[PDB]
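Q: Joint fold for the lines below.
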Amino acid sequence: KVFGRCELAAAMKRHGLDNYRGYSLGNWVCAAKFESNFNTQATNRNTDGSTDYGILQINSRWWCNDGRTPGSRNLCNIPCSALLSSDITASVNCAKKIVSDGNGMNAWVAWRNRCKGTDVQAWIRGCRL
Ligand SMILES: [Cl-]
Ligand SMILES: [Cl-]
Ligand code: NA
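A: Joint structure:
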């Protein structure tokens, strides 16, 4: 599923992401925009053989099992395919664990490079929330 900007914002808010660990809703929407272009089905292969999955491009080296990343962990305890569903619950739940692991949202390179230090609130402007 390809989410609309305000549609995704509302879904993230409902799942408790707004100001989760101090990150306002605009941050999460901005990261989803530049990680996946709001597409739950996005996949990307990394040089080390791991793969990133779903709307927040969660990586198989640490966080999910895709059966093809040798010597990897599965810290959200889910198959990576679960992260591609049109229901974002698994992606959200896993993201909460990632952002809690000490490095905040710097774990997402696109957030660090394209959202951090910008007016992120613009990403939820105009939305009925
Ligand atoms: Cl915001
Ligand atoms: Cl933080
Ligand atoms: Na894994």
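Q: Anything notable?
A: The chain has one domain: 1-129. Residues 60, 64-65, 69, 72-74 surround sodium ion (ligand 3) (CB under 6 Å).
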